[PDB]
Design a binder for these strands. Structure first.
Ligand SMILES: [Mg+2]
Ligand SMILES: [Mg+2]
Lengths: 303, 304, 302, 305
DNA sequence: TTCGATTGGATTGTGCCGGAAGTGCTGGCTCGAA
DNA sequence: CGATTGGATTGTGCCGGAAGTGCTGGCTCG
């Protein structure tokens, strides 16, 4: 049975453990540097095996030694209370990286800690894992927002909207209007039929970009959709589903960029990243991609 | 709890009943004119509730009276032939079933499978009196399942991450719209440009899709698992108000320039039945193919 | 599509909304008296429809008006105390008035503690039929018992079956005689020394004190409670007719009337379809009496 | 991704491949000695990955070569009618052949035998394949008890899975139905009998129906394959996902119930290493006698190969 | 001897804890680094 | 000269035509 270690047992970590039990995906270690809290969350969550008809062990840990034998490692831990946080979190990535190198070098790694396109590269470098075995959360979450908003305007099933958002997670994310479909049909056909206007689409783009802030302004925090997105990625690996999912991955010349991680459609299968798909962007799209990657580079230079 | 009546309990009916219990979608009546056989199949299937943790009653019936109170009616009954003399026989069958739906469950959502489906669904529509948004025919979900699958195996992605539209009619004149294929939301043409798959291979896959039933029958098997799964995807989208976009046969009222006939097109299936009929903005060549499919449907409608 | 209203959008509410979308069970209104927060949680949760391939509307509300047309109402609101009767009574009065006015045909699940009192108060003030309102208790408590036993015997957790009756709280009645494993009496595993009588007693104590244990570990128990509640709600919404131990109005069972208590029930499409009275021996009956007496005692303090 | 080889692609095999795709459990090889048909079934079934959102390869095979690297092997192949005890040597022959291949090609596979009489055939395949006793079991109790559980649940109007029951000894007419061990929502059946929700006579009628179910279905011009396939997949899934379900299956007895060197139906725990526990029920005298009779019939047939 | 307390969190805040008030925080404590 | 442990509508080694809730004439393989 797979061993899944959640490095970070905060809000997103907790929902991830709950979903893993629901789906009977594997044993779970809820790790946190904070004492006792993850053991308490783990004890609560373990009882839900009964309701789920599952059998996943869910335990808490405050020791990185429990990374031993992990098949999947999901990193959410890090400071959130700004550029000033960058060296702090770098420190954490170094620490985690060391342990991965020593304890679970064959693990598949998903990084969530923000800014994710920086943090995922730092952990890649410090852990020594292969480029096909480490990715960052970005596109699956962002595009879930876009797909959902469009679906609500057009009154269709959310999953039947497809869309691509690339480059980076965060305010520089590249929303590609040209690549939106509904039930396989170009969005433009629905714009032509006046079911949705270009202005409404732009409003939805802005809302997609601003969604985390919208949720925080309402005195909540985004963790349910992020957790679900991360588990969709992990499951595609663990069950070798080969879903196309937009994640942050090492660029080796794609879009004209190297030595940097960026969001792009990827195929996630049993061996990890099995394909990196490079979209055939036009010049304005490429300029937006360049600006996203430039912001990632700028922040990386500040660690 | 929804009542689902399977009018026809052959091999497709057996798989549909199995899947309904797996998904705990509703009580099932397995109807057939053949005596005792559907009672036997229903008895076998009912025990699988234990393994599924479901609670769907599954019963067999040789009486149309059990259509009473049906929320969903799926019609697979009718004479078959391996892949025109059937048109009058199956017309008479649609008349009989229609009379019973009209009198026993006029509010049911109807899914027609009986071939040639684009003709038979209109005949049942006419003799049942149900509203145009409450009856559809199986076509696109099945055919596109083949297309999506074959492409996905050449590109090494999850089969459902391929999207495709096949329209017009269910049969040899099905319109396969190359322009509308995507993979993980990306136009297929980008994969052709990168030589991940060629134009010629896609042509070969179109031909294989059209001829898949024949391919399976030549291998001494009968296609019924994929058809059953497609039908249950449709029925579930209605029962759970999911509003999936699914290509099915529906009454055309001017779309693509045609009226008074049923044809395959993308539809939204929700709690009120067909909620939207989506007309694709086809170019001239695509429209010519659509025309040919609907013309074949018309040709056959003239032979009942 | 069913409409499910969560009256209370705290941490248990959040997990319930998450699970409802995962299972595509119905549209969800997350209500709370706290402004803006439930709209935020609802927004976050709504996006998970994509990942789940579901289509549930999830919205937030600070208005009881949105109870209108609810098929299921789950009440978790109320003041809490870490491991108030008049306060939460006033809340049950308010909510009850709105259910009576806006959704009198809803199926009601009460979680607000002490649950066996609060469920009766909401029953009285809402006017809903006795077969349409129950309290959370047994499904959660027995999930603890079943889990701990399964981990000592190394079997799938749900293959342990057990009944805990009477009340949800320290006076819960743990029926050792009714525990089975893969359908086999627990006593056979004790005879074979796969588990001891003493270990079973230690597990009973742990089950009773699990909320305290979780709080002592600096966490709040809300995942398993949310899952238990959704199992109950789902049994109603899909007419599954599961046997689930819940708090229900007693009308003579176990020698008691005019009070709610935990007993095995059948939950189906019409609500509580059967109330099953266990054939308890004298000792078990005395424990049941103690649980109910505590519920009555507290009911006198509203 | 696990490799599941279906040795036999008839009615039960077909439904098993359908369910494996529905549950995304693994790649499937539909083997049969009959040419072409399994390739056809596999082609049809493979398209259902789209509707199921799964990604299982489903292929057909007429060669035992494809047992290579199997993680799970499910054996339904064998004679069911004359080309009756006369079938026993024929099927023995088949078990010999399969066994050789398993030994050479997938000795680490988990094996589920369905070919009837299962309690005999499973031991023959055990002997000829050389796999460990914790890696091979026979279908029996999960199916038979699904019948008993279902009929009881319908009389009492509860969820079928909330009825628990144990049927032991052998899969066939000598199956041992244990009234003492029936519970409903975890409550002893006797409480429902005391409450006149169901009578002792009705329970006896249901026991008879449970024993007679296969015949009842055949008499109605059908054949049992949906519930058998579901039962088999429940067993296989408990192995593949390490669920550690308690499931009644046919397993090698080494003294339990007073028998050795024979397979019989008993509650087992199925986990990631195979049979993790064999649970011996503390049967009373009458129950143990019925168990004895079941095992005696298995031995009688085993003596005729 | 002084004085801050992990990348998390219940109702409130938030190193931990009890007592208190009641849609709701802080005064007193231990441990350990500087 | 009977035909793998399977099967569509029917039966059932295979295939094609025929009739129409529905089989068997003609063929070829070792
Ligand atoms: Mg902190
Ligand atoms: Mg044969």
């Amino acid at each position: 049975k797979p061993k899944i270690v959640l490095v970070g047992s905060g809000m997103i970590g907790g929902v991830m453990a709950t979903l893993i039990v629901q789906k009977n995906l594997g044993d779970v270690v809820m790790f946190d540097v904070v004492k006792n809290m993850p053991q308490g969350k783990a004890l609560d969550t373990s009882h839900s095996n009964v309701m789920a008809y599952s059998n996943c062990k869910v335990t808490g840990s405050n020791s990185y030694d429990d990374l031993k034998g992990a098949d999947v490692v999901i990193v959410t831990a890090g400071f959130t209370k700004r550029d000033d946080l960058l060296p702090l979190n770098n420190k954490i990535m170094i620490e985690i990286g060391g342990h991965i190198k020593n304890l679970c070098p064959n693990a598949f790694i998903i990084v969530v800690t923000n800014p994710v396109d920086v943090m995922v590269q730092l952990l890649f470098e410090h852990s020594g894992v292969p480029k096909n075995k480490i990715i960052g959360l970005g596109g699956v979450l962002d595009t879930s927002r876009l797909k959902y908003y469009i679906s609500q305007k057009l009154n269709v099933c959310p999953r039947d909207v497809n869309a691509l958002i690339v480059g980076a997670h965060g305010n520089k994310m590249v929303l590609l209007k040209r690549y939106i479909t509904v039930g396989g049909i170009p969005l433009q056909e629905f714009i032509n039929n006046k079911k949705i206007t270009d202005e409404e689409v732009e409003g939805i783009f802005d809302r997609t970009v601003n969604t985390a802030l919208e949720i925080v302004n309402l005195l909540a925090s985004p963790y349910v959709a992020p957790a679900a997105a991360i588990i969709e990625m992990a499951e595609s690996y663990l069950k070798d589903i080969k879903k196309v999912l937009v994640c942050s991955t090492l660029l080796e010349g794609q879009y004209g960029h190297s030595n940097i991680f960026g969001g792009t459609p990827l195929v996630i299968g049993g061996t990890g990243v099995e394909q990196v798909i490079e979209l055939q962007l036009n010049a304005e799209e490429k300029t937006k991609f360049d600006e996203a990657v430039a912001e990632t580079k700028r922040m990386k230079a500040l660690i």
